Amino acid sequence: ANTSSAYNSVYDFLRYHDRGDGLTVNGKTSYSIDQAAAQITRENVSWNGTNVFGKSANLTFKFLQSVSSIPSGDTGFVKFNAEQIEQAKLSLQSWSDVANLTFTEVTGNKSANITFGNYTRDASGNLDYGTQAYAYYPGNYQGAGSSWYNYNQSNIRNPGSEEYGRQTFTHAIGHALGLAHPGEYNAGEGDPSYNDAVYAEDSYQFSIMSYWGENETGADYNGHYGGAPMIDDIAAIQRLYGANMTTRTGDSVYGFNSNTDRDFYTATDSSKALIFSVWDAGGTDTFDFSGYSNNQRINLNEGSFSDVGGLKGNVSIAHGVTIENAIGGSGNDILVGNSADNILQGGAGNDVLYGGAGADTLYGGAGRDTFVYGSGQDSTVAAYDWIADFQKGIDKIDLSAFRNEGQLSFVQDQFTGKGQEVMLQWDAANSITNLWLHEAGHSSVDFLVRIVGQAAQSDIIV
Numbered sequence: 001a002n003t004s005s006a007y008n009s010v011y012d013f014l015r016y017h018d019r020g021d022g023l024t025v026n027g028k029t030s031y032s033i034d035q036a037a038a039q040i041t042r043e044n045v046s047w048n049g050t051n052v053f054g055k056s057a058n059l060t061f062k063f064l065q066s067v068s069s070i071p072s073g074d075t076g077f078v079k080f081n082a083e084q085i086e087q088a089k090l091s092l093q094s095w096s097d098v099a100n101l102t103f104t105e106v107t108g109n110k111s112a113n114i115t116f117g118n119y120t121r122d123a124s125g126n127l128d129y130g131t132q133a134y135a136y137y138p139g140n141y142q143g144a145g146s147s148w149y150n151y152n153q154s155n156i157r158n159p160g161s162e163e164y165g166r167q168t169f170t171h172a173i174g175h176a177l178g179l180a181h182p183g184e185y186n187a188g189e190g191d192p193s194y195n196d197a198v199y200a201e202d203s204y205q206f207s208i209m210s211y212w213g214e215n216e217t218g219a220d221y222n223g224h225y226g227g228a229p230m231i232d233d234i235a236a237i238q239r240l241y242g243a244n245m246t247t248r249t250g251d252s253v254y255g256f257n258s259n260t261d262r263d264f265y266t267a268t269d270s271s272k273a274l275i276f277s278v279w280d281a282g283g284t285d286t287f288d289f290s291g292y293s294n295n296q297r298i299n300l301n302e303g304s305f306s307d308v309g310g311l312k313g314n315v316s317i318a319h320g321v322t323i324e325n326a327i328g329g330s331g332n333d334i335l336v337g338n339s340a341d342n343i344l345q346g347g348a349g350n351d352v353l354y355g356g357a358g359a360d361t362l363y364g365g366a367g368r369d370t371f372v373y374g375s376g377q378d379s380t381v382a383a384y385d386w387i388a389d390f391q392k393g394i395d396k397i398d399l400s401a402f403r404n405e406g407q408l409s410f411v412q413d414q415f416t417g418k419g420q421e422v423m424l425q426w427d428a429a430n431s432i433t434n435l436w437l438h439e440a441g442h443s444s445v446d447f448l449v450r451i452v453g454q455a456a457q458s459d460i461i462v
């Protein structure tokens with residue numbers, strides 16, 4: 001079963017960052033999304049009480065203007081500045097986007113579920129320029145839900161320009177909602193490291209509640225920080241409060257030309273980095289990564305990771321989400337669809353497109369592109385694929401995967417019945433080329449790929 005390098009690149013990319021199922025990664029136990037979610041919510045606490053799951057919540061938040069004391073003992077209180085307020089609201093929004101939560105600001109003497117405030121000194125009254133931030137779990141105790149940040153840190157004062165600040169806000173709010181660090185560790189306590197992680201997926205690539213960089217799991221964000229909930233965070237927060245099915249239910253576009261009105265899902269130009277795990281509750285959606293020149297690998301399968309804009313493992317799709325279309329850039333990309341009907345556009349460069357199950361429409365774009373098929377279920381007659389811009393003598397249709405059940409043979413105009421034969425039929429009236437494949441074990445011809453344009457036998461890889 002010697003398959004092509006194109007098929008192999010798809011086969012391997014589909015297994016990129018496989019997790020759970022008794023696997024061992026980095027010498028650690030591998031957790032599935034749900035296992036990581038249960039670990040992150042191990043304190044079993046939320047604003048609805050203890051051991052209460054799938055229950056929505058309407059919460060209040062406040063930017064403290066003064067304090068009688070900070071619950072931690074720290075001192076030198078400083079209220080949130082305008083930039084911190086705006087970024088904190090964006091962090092709150094990134095959480096309410098995915099879970100059934102509503103946030104309403106309160107002012108004056110009114111109490112609030114979640115509060116924000118800065119500190120600058122320790123209990124002894126000495127300047128603290130080393131710590132970052134901390135927050136308290138939901139509860140009925142003094143300080144529950146309060147979050148605090150070190151004003152002496154520039155990233156805390158300028159969260160809109162220093163990415164770690166925004167990520168810190170999202171992280172802290174996570175605690176204020178009931179989420180814990182993926183492992184038993186905290187700042188100030190000894191000096192933990194990724195080696196102390198309970199499971200392999202305890203890193204920024206999977207959870208912003210982690211303490212470890214995305215590099216620990218093989219990802220690379222080139223010095224950037226995502227700022228929004230990642231895949232395991234989304235599953236975790238939804239475990240506690242339920243999923244928000246009213247978010248972006250229309251046709252949504254992520255990346256370039258985005259209509260999300262969310263900075264973390266938007267790329268205004270090629271120099272912008274994208275780091276996100278998408279939550280989308282409906283409609284026909286598109287991953288538009290057309291503005292990059294880097295060779296990208298885009299996967300539309302729920303729960304999967306993609307390598308976008310030169311970064312590694314920076315984009316993922318949350319469990320329970322179906323993204324339909326993808327657009328690559330000028331680089332040599334790999335686009336992998338899911339079981340839904342996908343429209344894939346490779347763009348310039350030599351791309352590898354794989355529609356998977358469902359009736360997909362594929363555009364290789366300029367360049368020497370390869371349209372890959374891994375099984376007869378990829379393009380059944382009842383839901384056939386369309387390759388709309390095939391270039392005879394330039395593009396290729398890869399059927400090497402069918403070798404695992406016998407080498408495919410080319411027939412000119414008739415099937416013998418022996419099976420495992422491929423045929424190209426030209427429809428002069430419509431200028432359409434029908435690619436028929438009579439697969440072994442199939443009494444009837446059940447595989448068909450319709451091509452808008454001419455195709456030669458030498459363009460078909462068997």
Ligand SMILES: [Ca+2]
Pocket residue numbers: 247248249250251252280281282283284285
């Ligand atoms: Ca949508």
Ligand SMILES: [Ca+2]
Pocket residue numbers: 280282283284285322323324
């Ligand atoms: Ca969708």
Ligand SMILES: [Ca+2]
Pocket residue numbers: 328329330331332333346347348349350351
């Ligand atoms: Ca491309």
Ligand SMILES: [Ca+2]
Pocket residue numbers: 337338339340341342355356357358359360
């Ligand atoms: Ca598909």
Ligand SMILES: [Ca+2]
Pocket residue numbers: 346347348349350351364365366367368369
């Ligand atoms: Ca192309």
Ligand SMILES: [Ca+2]
Pocket residue numbers: 364365366367368369391394395
């Ligand atoms: Ca092409």
Ligand SMILES: [Ca+2]
Pocket residue numbers: 355356357358359360377378379384385
């Ligand atoms: Ca298909």
Ligand SMILES: [Zn+2]
Pocket residue numbers: 134171172175181209
């Ligand atoms: Zn923390």
